[PDB]
Assembly symmetry: D2
Homo-oligomer: 398 residues x 4
């Protein structure tokens, strides 16, 4: 099994799988254990010294987690991956390992709300300078770069607007002018099936596994993906010391299980979303549809440059404010009123009347997060059913 | 009911249990879910705006985790608790939530290794200043206090030799010297069954639930306990943003399950360890035994004031060095060669040839570790079997 | 949610889902509990009397299991379903509830090996008469029917030959002549996505959920599906008393999770199998391919009569005996040498050198289970990878 | 090691543990897998042909389940054991594996309800003949023996009133009267910590592990224990074909976890129940208490011969009837209204208004159930709290 030459599905299914060498179990065993047994004091000493392979203690590493790490690194085309007990855990642990007091970060002004809060209010308590910029005007990006800029943090498509960012072109410019700077890309919305930021110049990829990679709405987990040199530091410092964000081995087993169908779900998510997006664009209550697959969309061709599929997140604005948005939220029958995304169940959320949250009213005016903006996570249901349900709720405001 | 007034076991078994109101199931359901459903758009807005309690999303809170949080707070006598995905996660999230660049921490110079690394190499990287002190020398502690000291961090009994710290004296001291200073006490080795730092004047208690609280060697998890106001910031800042240290609902279920027998397990751990410590002190291969229950122990009296039982951790020094520790390790048959503790299986490590193998013999003497020190977590087995196994191993190094 | 009018995927995803009315959890909670609490002695007495709804004790019923039961009944078009701790558990419990000492069974002579053993050696220890017949010659079927025939048991397509059986036409004839007789159909190989035997005249459907319905090779479970009147007896007698085959609530949660992608997996299983079957039919080491989707296949048009898709099990005979079969089993690199079926991983098994098992050498001569017969469970991998691996192993015997 | 020679707790904790040979993990891995991989086509043929041990497919056997099977066999002193997906599953699979149409069973007339239903209404439907007897009257037992009697089925102590059966006398009798007869003893209420029927001459022991063996109210499971030769047929016939009663590897993991504290839990269950039984007998609302540890108990001496401890089940009759039982049930605040037993939470049921509500007052008198009988499973709470809660409930019916 020189797995790396094979298809995506084969890699998702068989990649990183070591095998139960003692009983021959087909399925990955759940090594639900806190600690590990040494055969000798010498073997222990050598595991602690780095001389020998093998396991010590589940905060430091666990066989079930190792497999899903190796599987995702393989899918992203990265040397190494670390799995964490949440997406924010993988992001924080990566940021802690890469930065120190006095370093500087350039971030996108359009981010997942808790990433913005981590950057805006968290890292800045601890001596890290942060500048939020429009990643669509590279001159703005290039002028934010200071001699001590260590991370450029980007998310594409961006939660909640689906704004797309030229990964190759920011990476090139940053790498030309700041040789010490990492380019981080949050690839949650895409998964490696749709977008592989490491092939476009990114140095570090982060995911909320809570979303598409697990895919079943029963796991909180994250990953960081990148060079072995740096991921090793994320494991031995960001996770071991700074965050203690240890994925439960049972949760790792569930991510492995969900990744068995990652190819099939992303294909179905996206075919559903494209039908839904076209419906929304033609409905009389809708003013603007935000979707990478619509030719009307501002970042359509940047999406076509980086994304195999337009994805399965849709945002749209109703004619009418928050009030018409609330009316739709409160009368869908198949769509589920919840945050998160990437589940079998279609999810709908209305930042304007709920999570407008970690941003101030002004700070999301800058990012383009209007009231009346609805965000839709298109599920795996039959598309006619999703559309019928959206249609009945939208007809209420016509 | 008056659950606060009941016995300890009644509290461990029944405390924090909200109940399954839809189907009445006896066991706490595993709410293995990432997200939650809102009844209206406005309900979700109220919950995100702090105007209303209720669930939103498991990184911010989960019903299974809430239950074990409520149960441990009740046992510690604290107002609130947060469970994290590891001991270090609960420690780091608490420290992050109380500190900022420009703050100062006073810490014991005798701590769990990874706690020490986080303090010495981690927080100092981010503008926090840390002074390490010998907590036995109260005058040396009061001297290290600065006006920006925001955390005094203690661990008692501590690694690797079970040094005990006078919780009430130092906190009484710290509190009248600086009104804004949190006193942290790591209470892993004791659990609330043996020691309750908050009633001794501590502000925040941290736990590695990986050890005795879960007690079954199948969970990595942590807790912090204290005032509702601070724990809310540990949840909404330290967990939500800074660490992402989210316990799996499954792991919280297992911790709940493990806590049903905490009273019973702590009693047996301590009964066994008292017998093992007596035997080790009388054995000819053994130079010194560190056990709070032995009247030879330097902090015997102070431990007898703070701890309901002398615990079940044991450190002892062999007459000998690395080669001696290696032989004992490589010949125990019931005890298990493994780091960690608080397990039903008796665990044993020899740091000089194992955990502290990478360091030099001199650096290991800077960490309190002789070449003959052995650390012992006494399990739930029959004491005669534990002792017999230790006896034949140690007899191999008697001259 | 009048769910029954919606698409298959929507039903698989949302069907049977009650909802967490206390905390609003999206995912089904795991009610991992032995017993349930009464609010009053009166409420207890009424639950035991049948007067009140609600739960008593997990052998009698469990909320997590109730949901996957209701979900599968909805997909099959049956009134009720019971989930069991194995496929054999659902089959035995159904058979125990329907039969008594002195009743008679007509069964197909081509069956899953342990079903044959249950019928041939198990029920006959306990006074049940059993006659094994060729379900392809209805005159043979009709002549086996005795006045005391109570079950006609059939499996289509049959493990291991994939022989197809006219469900509508046996059901009609049996129902005309033996008004007291149940028609059981094992629908494991198809799932309700491909075949709905209750719509063709069957009275009872059984599944090994261990295979496609769970789909992830980490669960042993079964179902019976049928009229409420009879399923209620299976629950209160077959499961409660005769087998004690109680699905663990955690396993039920895993089946629910696997059914979220049942539509997507069956589509992918079958498109893969059709490509593999055509490859096998053209390879010089292969003498005969057994696959419903091949026009060469004996039961092609009976398959087209009953099956939306030709399925994803393939059997084939090599030119050469067991010896060439073993050579292929021992040199595949991506296919996994294991029994079971319906997993993400392609599985290959060689009854001739392994499980030829519960049949005698003669009894499978009658059913058509030759040596040199290989059975293939086509997985979810990329088809080129599955075919490349089969090709290299088969080339060894050319 | 000489695990057979060690103490009980050492056996419960370490017994049957094969070990994770690939990674050395301390906890038993959850082998949550349906199927297994063969190294060659011929290896799979050897395993299906009984020529070779090893795994095939989880309905035939799973490594997590094997471990808990080995552990329980060791505790009972039996050769082998099979775990099933419920108590009834292990009972039914054993009975199926030993009987056939034309066989005869002698059973106690005082059994667990669903066991009785299976015997009286289930097996008789399939040509098996069943005679129910009073096992206290040895002459009535020997009289019901027939040449085709293949099972003598016992349960001691039994529902609902804790009748004790002389295991060694009846089995000694049965064995010299009929050489091919299996003696079954249901050992649920005791566990191997208290009673071991195989050393008293029984052939097969059955368990509902749902009760004390798991002990945490989150598993439905069963066991049968006995000679390797019979248990192999229970596995390869009774489980594989006749019942399909396959334990989830996850459930087996939980039973293993629960058994780490079995010794500790049985001690506390019994200490608490002895205090609860004394209090109940002295209480004015209580007519009679059925407890093996009370010298008033009809089978006190026989129980003292067979049982290491008097157990933790308690039946008692109220001075009163259905209306009295209802009031007590509807006013306990710590005890839980629920069927089942062997849980860390104290459980209580009043059969006349609850489990046996569907039957008439006369049929319930045919089942040993007065209108004032209450069944009590004493938990792991503090005894004062259990008693206080029972006291205020019972005081509501004192004249
Ligand atoms: C939800 C989300 C996260 C947060 O990850 P968690 O698993 O919730 O900690 C991070 N990035 C993006 C783009 C998200 O949508
Ligand atoms: C093991 C330990 C910790 C760390 O907890 P983890 O759960 O391993 O992250 C902290 N303090 C003490 C005393 C410990 O023993
Ligand atoms: C594997 C199989 C079964 C047996 O079900 P289990 O889940 O293994 O008990 C029954 N029917 C068919 C067609 C099978 O392939
Ligand atoms: C509960 C019980 C059983 C039945 O076991 P289940 O696991 O519920 O199927 C059998 N015998 C006794 C004594 C019991 O208490
Ligand atoms: Cl989100
Ligand atoms: Cl540790
Ligand atoms: Cl199979
Ligand atoms: Cl019961
Ligand atoms: Na989902
Ligand atoms: Na699979």
């Amino acid at each position: 099994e020189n797995i790396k030459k094979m298809g995506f599905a084969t890699k998702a299914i068989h990649g990183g799988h070591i095998g139960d060498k003692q009983f021959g179990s087909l399925a990955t065993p759940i090594y639900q254990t806190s600690t590990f047994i040494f055969d000798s004091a010498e073997q222990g000493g050598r595991r602690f010294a780095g001389e020998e392979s093998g396991y010590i203690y589940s905060r430091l590493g666990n066989p079930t987690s190792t497999e899903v790490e190796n599987k995702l690194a393989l899918l992203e085309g990265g040397e190494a991956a670390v799995v964490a007990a949440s997406g924010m855990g993988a992001i924080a642990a990566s940021l802690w390992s890469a930065l120190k007091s006095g370093d500087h970060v350039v971030a996108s002004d359009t981010l997942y709300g808790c990433t913005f809060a981590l950057l805006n209010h968290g890292l800045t308590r601890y001596g890290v300078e942060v500048t939020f910029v429009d990643v669509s005007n590279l001159d703005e990006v290039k002028n934010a770069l200071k001699p001590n800029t260590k991370v450029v943090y980007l998310e594409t498509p961006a939660n909640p607007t689906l704004k797309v960012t030229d990964i190759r072109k920011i990476s090139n410019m940053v790498h030309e002018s700041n040789k010490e700077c990492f380019v981080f890309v949050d690839n949650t919305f895409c998964t490696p099936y749709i977008q592989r930021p490491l092939e476009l110049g990114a140095d570090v990829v982060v995911h909320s596994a809570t979303k598409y990679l697990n895919g079943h709405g029963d796991v909180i987990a994250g990953f960081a993906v990148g060079k072995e040199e740096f991921i090793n530091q994320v494991k031995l410092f960001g996770i071991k010391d700074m965050t203690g964000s240890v994925t439960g081995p049972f949760e790792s087993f569930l991510i492995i299980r969900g990744m068995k169908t990652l190819q099939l779900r992303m294909e179905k998510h996206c075919k559903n979303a494209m039908e839904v997006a076209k419906f929304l664009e033609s409905h009389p209550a809708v003013e603007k549809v935000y979707y990478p697959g619509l030719e009307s969309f501002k970042y359509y061709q940047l999406a076509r440059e980086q994304m195999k599929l337009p994805g399965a997140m849709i945002s749209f604005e109703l004619k009418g404010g928050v009030e018409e948005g609330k009316i739709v939220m409160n009368n869908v029958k198949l769509a589920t009123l919840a945050v998160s995304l990437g589940d079998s169940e279609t999810l709908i959320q209305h930042p304007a009347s709920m999570t407008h949250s970690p941003y101030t009213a002004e700070e999301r005016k800058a990012a383009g997060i209007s009231d009346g903006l609805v965000r839709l996570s298109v599920g795996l249901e039959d598309a006619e059913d999703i559309i019928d349900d959206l249609k009945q709720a939208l007809d209420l405001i016509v």
